[PDB]
Each structure stands twice: as C-alpha cells, then as structure tokens.
Amino acid sequence: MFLTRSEYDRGVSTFSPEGRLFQVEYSLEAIKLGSTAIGIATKEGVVLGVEKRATSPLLESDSIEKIVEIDRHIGCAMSGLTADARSMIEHARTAAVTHNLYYDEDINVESLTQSVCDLALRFGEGASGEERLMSRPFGVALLIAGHDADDGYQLFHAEPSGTFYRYNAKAIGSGSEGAQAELLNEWHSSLTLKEAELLVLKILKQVMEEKLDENNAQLSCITKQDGFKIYDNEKTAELIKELKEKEAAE
Amino acid sequence: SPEGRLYQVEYALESISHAGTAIGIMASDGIVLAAERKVTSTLLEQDTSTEKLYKLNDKIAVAVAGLTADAEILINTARIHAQNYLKTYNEDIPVEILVRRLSDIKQGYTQHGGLRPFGVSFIYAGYDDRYGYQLYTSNPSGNYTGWKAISVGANTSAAQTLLQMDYKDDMKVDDAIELALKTLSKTTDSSALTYDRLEFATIRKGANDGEVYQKIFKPQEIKDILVKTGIT
Amino acid sequence: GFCELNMSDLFELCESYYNKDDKASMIMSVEIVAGLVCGSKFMSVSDLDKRDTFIENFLAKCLDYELNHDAFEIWSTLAWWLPAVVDLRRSKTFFCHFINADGMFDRESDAATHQTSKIYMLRSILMSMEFRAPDVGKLFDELVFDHPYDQVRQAVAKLLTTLVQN
Amino acid sequence: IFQVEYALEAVKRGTCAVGVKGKNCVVLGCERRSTLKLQDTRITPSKVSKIDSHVVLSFSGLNADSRILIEKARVEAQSHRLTLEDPVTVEYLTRYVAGVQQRYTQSGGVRPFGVSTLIAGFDPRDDEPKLYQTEPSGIYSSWSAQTIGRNSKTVREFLEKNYDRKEPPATVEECVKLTVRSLLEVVQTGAKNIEITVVKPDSDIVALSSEEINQYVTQIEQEKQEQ
Amino acid sequence: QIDYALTAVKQGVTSLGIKATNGVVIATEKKSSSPLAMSETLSKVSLLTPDIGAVYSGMGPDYRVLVDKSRKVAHTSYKRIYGEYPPTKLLVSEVAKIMQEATQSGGVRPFGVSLLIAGHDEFNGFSLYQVDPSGSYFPWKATAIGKGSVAAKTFLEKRWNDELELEDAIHIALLTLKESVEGEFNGDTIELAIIGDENPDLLGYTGIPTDKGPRFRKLTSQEINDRLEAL
C-alpha cells in the first residue's frame, strides 16, 4: 500500500496549476456515492426509477421522496442529500409556474433545467461583478425528465457544478459506473415505454445485488398524454412480477 | 464539537466555578439571595458597587456569579424587557417569561458561533401572582431550572450538600436567612465571614399587608443579621 | 469483641438504604454489601452463614425482576470490582446466585420476556476472575443464539466471548 | 464540511424521546432525572410542547436549543392560520421545522441544531393520525412509531417487535399501555422518570399527570411477574 | 489579548487618585519626550464635565480619543435628555461600555489605557473610579496605576484615613508622586487636578444663582511649585 497526494488538494475556489477546481471536482464524486437513480427516454415517454432502501417496517416508506413533480410535464429524480435539494426544487417549481404566468405556455425542459443550474452557479463567499449569494456548491445531482413540443421527450443530468448534458439514458448514484455501461449496451432509438419501464428494473436488480420489491424501488414516468405520475406500489409490482417472468425466458 | 460537546461553553461554565459564590433559598413566604465579593483590597470602596446583586424590577432580582462587565450587558437588556411588558400589557412581567427571555439570548451565542458566549450564571428571585414565589437558574448553556434552594460559582458542589441537609419545606423566611449564611460557613475560602465580603437581598410578604416588598441590604443591616451567629 | 452490634444490624442498615428511587442511597446500600464480603477476613462460621443467608435473600429482592438502568448501573459496577478485591469463594451464595440462570428465552410469539437482567453482570464477574471459579459445564449447554431481541442476542455473544477467554 | 454528524451526537446523549400511532389517537413520551432533591417540581414539567390546539412536539437533545424551535414553529403555526386561515397540517408544520434545521448549515455558515424532534397530531377535520420525526440534517420521515434520544436504539428494537400495522392499538387506553412499557426499558427509576401527553381527533390534547401514570406502571408489573 | 493591553498599561507613566471628605485629587507626571517640546501643549489630566475629570496611564493617543469620545457621550446620552450633566457613576459606566465594545468587537484591539475618573454628583457625593481595558470598572478610596503602581498603592494604604481633608490628599499625592518620578519634579512636569468646592470664579458669567460653577480645577504651574516648597 501507499499514499499519493498533491499540494493543491483542499483548495477552496482556487485554481490548481492545471486549471482544476478540486473543491468542485470532489463535489462531483459524491454523486457516485448516494442512492441509485436511473432515467431512460423513449419516443413514448420517459422513465425515472430509484432505490428506496427502507430501514424498517415502522417507517412507512413514501416519506422517502426521491422522485418529485415539477410541473405536470416535468419530473426529476435525485441521488444524494435529498435534504439539501429542498431549495433546489423549490426554485425549479417556482421557475416553471413563473414562466407559465408570464407567457401562457409550459416551460421548455431545456430551459427549466438551465435555470436550476443557474441557481447552483451562485456558489461562493466573495464575488465582485455580479453577486452570487449562498455558501457551498449544491450537494445533489438531478435527473430531469419531461416533455415539450419543440424537442420531444428529454432527459438531463444537472450537476452541482452548474452545467449539464442531455443523456438519452443516464444513471447516477452508487451503481452508476456499472449501470451506465449497461444502459450504453441495451438502449436503442426505438424503445417502447413498456420496454423501458422494465429495463430500469433490470438495471436496478443488477447494481443492487438483491431481489427487489416496492419497499425498495419507486417507479415514475412522464407521458405527453397523462402527464407526470409516480407509480403507486401496486403497479410497480406487476411490473416487477412481469420481469420475474420475462427473464425466466432463457 | 467532537462527542456531542459544547466546548466554548464548558470553557466559560467552569470559568464560573472560579469567580464568586451565590445562593438562593425559597421559603414558604419569601425568597433569599446572597453572594461573596471578589478578592478585595483594603482601599476598594465597599459601599457603592452592589457589584453582584442587581435589581431587575420592583418584584424581581438576580444574583450574579461571573464576569461583571458581562452581566451588566445582559441585565441592562432584561430591565428593559420588564418595562416593555408593562407599557404593553399594563401588568408586571411574570418571572419565567423574563428568565426565558435571557436564557434565549445566552443560547443565542451558544449557536450563532460567530461571537463569544456569556460568563455569568444567574440566580433569579421573583414573585408574580401566577406562580407564587419563584427561584430560577441560568448557566450560559441556555438552560433554566426550578429550585427550592440553589448555588453557583466556586465551591458549588460543596454547598449544594449542606443545603440539601438543613432545608425543610415548612421553612419561614428568617429560618432561610440563616440557612443561607450558616452554609456560607463552609463554602468560604476566606477563614471567617465579614459583613463587607457580603451582599444580601429579600423578597418578603411585605413589611405590612398581603403584598411584596423588595430589600437589598445596606452594609449595616448585614452586620446586624450576621450578629445572629456568624460573627458578633 | 470490641463493638457488639451483631451482624443483623448491618443487614437492616443495608436493606434500609435500598430505595429503588434514590441513587446515592442505593450506592450506600451496595457499598455495604461489598463490605460484608470483604468481612470474611473475620471469624464466625456462624456469622458467615447468617451473611450467606442474608445475601441470597437480598439479591432476590433486588435483582430478581424489577430492575432500573440505575440499579444495573450500580450492581454492574460491583461485579467488575468485588471479585478483584476478594476471592469470591469466601461465600457460598453470592456467586452461586448470578450463575443461576433463569434468564434466556428462545422464540417470539409472546414478549419473549425481559433482559440482560443478568448476562452482562454474570459476565463482568466471570471477566474479573478469568481463571478461577469458571466451572461452567452449565452455561455452554445453556446458551441461546436463537433469541429474537438484539439487546440479548448481542449480550449472549459478548458473554461467550468471555466464556472462551477463560 | 462535517459538523452535522457531531450535533447528531448530542441528540444521542439527551432526554430520551418516543412516540406511537394508534387506530385513532397518538401519544408521545420523554424526560430525565426525577428531581435533584432540591429542585422546583411544579415549574418546568414542559416535556412535550403544544404547537397549536391540535399539534404537539417532543425532542431529544439540548433542552436550551429546543426552545428556539418550539417557538419559530408555534409562530408559523399562527402565521399560517393568519395568512391562509387554515390550521397548519402536521406534515407542513413538520416540513417547516425540519426545513429550518436544514437552513442552519448551508448558509452564512452557522451551527446546526442539537435536537431531533417528534411531531404528532391530527390534520384539521381529517381524523387520520400523523407522526413524524426530524433530525439536525433537515430530514423528515413519517413513522407508525419511533424513538430518538439516549438508549433510543434499545427502544426502536423493542417497538419494531411489538407494533404491527395489521392491528394498531385501537383503544385509547391501550395505546398508552404500550408507550409506557417501551420507556421502562431505558429509564432509571420508573414512573417518576418520564411522562406523557395524548392527542385525539379535533384539537383534543390532554397531557397525562403523575397519578394516571401510576395506575399504569403499577398495573403493568402486575401482569408481568405472572408466569 | 485583553491581558496584553493591561500590560501596556502596567508600563507607561504612573498616575494616581485619592478621594477625601471634601474633594477628590488625581495626578500623573508629564514625561517630556524631549526638552525641545513644550509640555504645556499636552494635557494628561482632562476635563470631562465641570464636575468630572480624568487621568490615565499608558498609551497617549488612546487616551486622547477616549477623552473626546467621552465628553461627547456625556451630552449625547445624558445632558441632551435630562438637562443635567451625568453623575460620576454613570458617565463612568458609559466609558466602560465604550472600551468593553472595543474588546468584544471584531477587527479592533482594546485600548492601551487604564483610566482614573474623579468627580462629584449632587446625590452620590464624591467618588473615584478606575476603568480598565477589559471594560470592567471599580470604585476606589485611592489607588495608582502604571509602573510605580505597586510602590504607590502600598504607600496609600499606609497614609489613608477616611477623615482626610482635600488639602491633606493633595499633600499625599505629591509625596506619592515624588518617589516614582522619572524625570524632574516641578510644576512643569506635574499635572494635578482636584474636584472640590464650586468655583464661581470660573463660570464666565454672573446672573443665575442656581448654577454655581465648576468643581473641577486644574492647578497651575505656579500653585504646584508653591506647595512643593512647603513640602
């Protein structure tokens, strides 16, 4: 065994000699170390699943809210400090209604996302030019998924760093490095919502190394028609039962 | 704050077990306050200070054990809360409410950890017509507690024991005046107790009716009750 | 010879300071017990029997059900100490009482039962002897493992650990 | 930035606190060392704190720290009745309390709270019991029952194996029957150690006294010894 | 950190104060930072109200800006409300509060001076106070501060009785200062003030018999030399 160490580790909002901002490079590794969360996009909807991980029969699951509504057409799933994202969500729900008021239309998923990033982009304790009023990078990653009529169904990864990518299917949290390399294998431009409802389960089964039920998985989706609903425990179950069978195929 | 510990607090909580020594005894028909005075020089002017026994309102008073300049900053703001609750509801402020009002400012620094905690621990003696006579305590922890008899400062752990011993619930007021002095037999680093090392106070059932007189003792009046045993 | 108070005077002085309520008062009672067991460096085999007899009677009232985290705090203090300031075989009843194990149920469709209303105290004696007295043909044949509660599952474990070091 | 976990430590060390849902009633329970002989008995028995006419709250932690919460809450409880004319819902009073401990970390850089809290009661009109728990982080959770505090782990273990959702303690009386047993495990004397409050549908909060608490302990340890 | 300021006070020229039955007296020495300097242009004994004066030991400047801030607070917080001037006890309180805030405030060091404030208010009579950098303040029959602190404080216990006439206390505070003196000892290197009878001579006007003039009088270069000969 042995110890590797730079002299510029630690450094808060100051550049390493490479141009690296290690305070924020680390902000980004702790997404890899929270609850699992997975989003997949079809041309027939978008699916978000997470890992519940109930720690008792008492604690009635569902106070475990790791997937929440934003407007009727935009949902997001979270991996990490669910408590640290209360404010991040308040700003997104507030931005989406505020847009609907000022403009009489649902707000673009691309711009709802960017608005949330523009919020966590106010990290600091000393800024001249424009003021960024807050204290630390926002300690939570987001999978944001919804539908606007310009650019079909969409999935987005909002990072604490204030930037984002639009994945056609993404996984974040404890399993991500592995779940991601599995989505990269099994995703095609022609999935059906039924097909992806399931693929999200198959990939939760894998990178949880366990057998799953409604006490440890929550499923939600967002269709043009019915909006953004979160599957109640019954439906999440005969979707699970439906996999126990589909994989007993061969 | 490593193990669930309030460090900057214990710091000052034990800085208290250094300075001063104060006592409170609730009788059935009165309350008593008492304190020893800091290391005195011959030339220090005894009668003036009233340095560790302060009046808050005509019906409430506190004994101090801690840094003087630090308690004055508190008391000044407590004498005011008293008067704001008057000008506002035209009734005299209830003891617990005043106590909590301070305790809440103490704990205000015990958390907005950008300024330094309070020296000072208080015994409060007061009367209000909702809860008879009352006795309270105020460490910079933020906590307050009810007491039939209590003590703060150096030699604290010791007096609490004699007090527990000689106290009876049926106690009168004069009976409790003694118990207070008597048990500053022990808890005195100065061999032999004088009238000048002392400061005293009482809240009795009035010198007349069914009401409430307050009395911070003048030096002579102490050398007079000291006469009952202490020194003669 | 010098006092003539008869031991039956320290048995009241002791039963006296046992208010299930007052902690510093119980601590005086159990300070008294530890003295009666350090008082075998003192004659009378007819008093060492009046005392062995008082002690099995007292540990009954006290430890045989109805036990607060205040008593447990005290007695458990004794178990770690006493066996180190006196060979416990100076008493037939005292030790041969904690090892009387009417305490370890086995399954849960009731309330199983109670506690380490023993385990952690028998253990802290067996820990302080570690060598001496440890004939425990019983205990090994009597351990549980099957217990539903944790506070016990964990304690049965912490005891076996100690039973093995002996 | 780690100071959070440290505070969560002070939780542990403090007055032990519990709570228990019922078929249509709710209960709390918690406190500390009887009386240090010479303390005034009748002027701080403020174990569980009333928030509105229908909502209560107990805590494990720094007693001097709770008060700042039990106020900021007792206030938003009115300032909701006032600006929306509608008593706060137990989830919302809870989310507001938790949401405050949360904002006591991530801005300015100030210290977080040394309290976990339990919050019980019935929403307005609705008669479905609600029980929640908060902790210095900012996390709120709903529980069929729970405990936080000192030796709280012994109790959470007890409860898990003594409560079942299939049949919740329907009787008013019996719902307390249970909350007592579960603190007798961790106390340090008995009835004189920890007390309880009880809220039933529609702003009917009736806290229990000393004498009703010993028509219980001494009606428990009866059935006990019967073997 | 307060402790280090008390240390700047412990060095720096000696000063003292003595209360009597019918007056108070305060004095220090005027150590000339040079013979070229005219020592009359700096005053170590300053008037705060016509009933109250002050002297210090320690850091020159910190005293000046404290004497200024102090005069003002006498008006802003008392005279402009109640029409009277403040009582010694309370003006002292308002100065301690001023220094106690330089302590507990961030970005500022406490003052490098201990103050001796002497005065007379109609109800509390005479009194003499000490104010430390800590913001604490104590009432004195007599004391000294600075280098000669220990020598002089001991001499004052030896020589002080509670039956002193003000003229007796002037006499003492000159001897006391004679043993400690660093430079020369005359009227040009001694500053002495008293708080005695009302001086109508010094009012500046005549016509209202209800206000009778300053109790504070600063002895002239001459009055001092006169006392030192019959000394």
Give the CATH number of the domain where residue A202 resides: 3.60.20.10
Nearest residue on chain A to D108, alpha-carbon basis: A135
Interface touch E142/B43, C-beta < 8 Å: yes
* Position A2 in a domain: no
State the Cα–Cα distance between residues D184 and C66, nearest whole angstrom.
10
Q: Do D110 and B160 touch (CB under 8 A)?
A: no
Q: What are phi and psi of B175, to 5 degrees?
A: -65, -35
Q: Which of E77, E126, E141, E172 to mutate against chain B (most B CBs within 10 Å)? A: E141
Any chain B CB within 8 A of the CB of E125? no
CB-CB: which of C65, C68, C111 is closest to D190? C68
**Contact (CB, 8 A) for D127 and D107:** no
β partners of residue E195: E24, E216
Cα gap B62→B82, rounded to integer Å:
13
Pure H helices in chain D: 3-13, 63-76, 78-81, 90-102, 152-160, 172-184, 210-213, 221-225
CA nearest to B61, candidates B79, B87, B35: B79
- What is the C-alpha to C-alpha distance for residues C19 and D189, in angstroms, rounded to an integer? 10
> Distance (Å, rounded) from C-alpha A46 to C-alpha A147?
9
The interface residues of chain D toward chain C in range 29-88, judged by CB-CB distance below 8 A, are: 34
Chain breaks in chain C (C to N over 2.5 A) after: none
* Among A68, A81, A153, residue whose Cα is nearest residue A110: A153
CA distance linking residue D114 with residue D119, whole number of Å:
16
Are C121 and C79 spatial neighbours (Cβ–Cβ below 8 Å)?
A: yes
Residue numbers after which chain A breaks, C to N beyond 2.5 angstroms: none
Spatial distance between the Cα atoms of B171 and D115, rounded to a whole number of angstroms: 39
Q: Is residue A161 part of a domain?
A: yes
- Contact at 8 Å (CB) between D30 and D18? yes
Q: Please tell me which residue of chain B has the smallest CA distance to D110.
A: B112
What are the φ and ψ backbone dihedral angles of B153, each rounded to 5 degrees? 105, -165
Quick one: chain A helix, strand, coil %, rounded to 5? 30, 20, 50
Q: Per DSSP, what are the bridge partners of residue D134?
A: D117, D140
Classify each residue of B134-161 as buried b or exposed e, where b means 16 or more C-beta atoms within 10 Å of its C-beta. Answer: bbbbbbbbbbbbbbbbbbbbbbbeebbe
Q: Which residues in chain B are followed by a discontinuity, with C-to-N distance exceeding 2.5 angstroms?
A: none
Residues 6+ away with beta carbon under 8 Å from B117: B8, B9, B11, B12, B106, B109, B110, B140
Is A204 a member of any domain?
yes
B154 Cβ contact partners less than 8 Å away, ≥ 6 residues apart = B17, B18, B19, B20, B21, B187, B189
- Which among D40, D63, D64 is the nearest to B148, CB-wise? D40
The label of the residue with tokens 């009529």 reads: A149
CB–CB contact D99 A57 (8 Å)? no
Residue B67: CB partners within 8 Å, gap ≥ 6? B19, B119, B120, E136
Handedness of CA B171, B174, B178, B180 (dihedral sign): positive
* 8 Å CB contact between E177 and E57: no
Cα E196 to Cα E168: distance, rounded to the nearest angstrom: 13
Q: Which of D60, D30, D51 is nearest to D93 (CA)?
A: D51
Residue D67 touches chain B, beta carbons under 8 Å? yes
Q: Do D1 and A63 touch (CB under 8 A)?
A: no
Q: Are D48 and D203 in contact (CB under 8 A)?
A: no
Query: CA nearest C38: which of C92, C99, C88?
Result: C88
Query: Which is nearest to D129 in space by CA: D137, D121, D141?
Result: D121
Q: How many domains does chain A have?
A: 1
Residue C151: list chain D partners with CB under 8 A.
154, 157
State which residue of chain E sits closest to B118, comparing Cα positions. Answer: E104
CB A137 within 8 A of CB A94: no
End-to-end CA distance of chain C: 41
Asked if residue A4 is part of any domain, the answer here is: no
Query: What strands, in cross-sheet order, belong to the sheet with E216-218?
Result: E142-145, E15-19, E24-29, E190-195, E216-218
Q: Considering the domain boundaries, does residue A1 fall inside one?
A: no
Best residue in B72, B75, B79 to probe E by mutation, most E CBs within 10 Å?
B72
Chain D within 8 Å of B134 (Cβ-Cβ)?
yes
Q: Are C160 and C143 in contact (CB under 8 A)?
A: yes
The neighbour count for residue A244, using CB atoms within 10 Å, is 11
Query: Do D34 and C148 make contact, defined as CB atoms within 8 angstroms?
Result: no
3-class secondary structure, B65: strand
Which strand (E) or helix (H) includes residue D131? Answer: strand D129-135
In angstroms, the Cα distances linking D194 to B41, D35, D145, D197, D223 are: 51, 12, 18, 11, 21
Tokens 């399954």 found at: C107
Alpha carbons A166 and A145: distance in angstroms, whole number: 10
Distance from CA of D162 to the nearest CA of C (A): 8
d(CA A116, CA A111) in angstroms, rounded, equals 9
- Rounded CA-CA distance E45/E57 in Å is 11
- Could you list the beta-strand ranges (E) of B117-212: 121-127, 133-138, 144-146, 149-153, 198-204
Q: Chain-centre distance of CA B14, in angstroms? A: 17
Phi first, then psi, for residue D186 (nearest 5°) are: -110, -15
The answer to whether residue A199 sits within a structural domain is yes
Query: What is the Rg, in whole angstroms, of the alpha carbon atoms belonging to chain B?
Result: 17
Alpha carbon of A93 to those of A46, A73, A76, A113, D97: distances in Å?
19, 11, 11, 11, 21
Position A250 in a domain: yes
Backbone φ/ψ region at E41: left (φ over 0), alpha (ψ -120 to 50), beta: alpha
Closest B-chain CA to D4: B1
Q: Given D40, D64, D68, which is nearest B146 (Cβ)?
A: D40
| C-alpha to C-alpha distance for B123 and B16, rounded to whole angstroms | 13
CB B36 within 8 A of CB B48: no
Chain D nearest CA to B163, separation (Å) = 8
Distance from CA of A83 to the nearest CA of D (A): 5
3-class DSSP string for chain E:
CHHHHHHHHHCCCCEEEEECCCCEEEEEECCCCCCCCCHHHCCCCEEEECCEEEEEEECHHHHHHHHHHHHHHHHHHHHHHHCCCCCHHHHHHHHHHHHHHHHCCCCCCCCCEEEEEEEEECCCEEEEEEECCCCCEEEECEEEECCCHHHHHHHHHHHCCCCCCHHHHHHHHHHHHHHHCCCCCCCCCEEEEEECCCCHHHCCCCCCCCCCCCCEEECCHHHHHHHHHCC
On the CB side of B45, how many CA atoms lie within 13 Å of its CA?
Answer: 22
Q: Residue count of chain A, please give it.
A: 250
- Most D-contacting residue of B23, B105, B107 (CB-CB within 10 A), to test interface: B107
Experimental method: X-ray
Give the residue from B154, B200, B193 showing the smallest Cα distance to B25.
B200
Mutation site, A24, A58, A89, interface D, largest D CB count within 10 A: A58
How far apart, in whole angstroms, are the C-alpha atoms of residue D7 and residue D209? 32
Q: Which residue has the tokens 């320690």?
A: E58
Residue D75: both structure tokens together:
């206030």
User: In angstroms, rounded to a whole number, what is the distance separating the alpha carbons of residues D149 and B4?
Assistant: 12
Facing residue for E134 by CB, picked from B43, B69, B115: B69
For chain D, say whether C149 makes contact (Cβ under 8 Å).
Answer: yes
**Quick check: A64 and A56 in contact, CB under 8 A?**
no
Q: How many CB atoms lie within 10 A of CB E223?
A: 14
Chain C: nearest CA to D158, how far in angstroms?
A: 8
Which 125-184 residues of chain D touch chain C by CB within 8 A? 151, 154, 157-158, 161-162
**Contact call for A59 and D143, based on CB within 8 A:** yes
The rounded distance, in Å, linking the Cα atoms of B215 and B94 is 19
Euclidean distance between CA atoms A89 and A74, whole angstroms: 12
Record: contact A60-D159, CB cut-off 8 A: no
Instruction: Write out the residue range of the structural domain in which residue A108 sits.
Output: 9-250
A-D CB pairs within 8 A amount to 49
The tokens of B87 are what?
A: 């000008």
Q: Do chains C and B touch (3 or more CB pairs under 8 A)?
A: no
Specify if A113 maps to a domain: yes
Tokens of D192: 């004189």
Q: Do D157 and C151 touch (CB under 8 A)?
A: yes
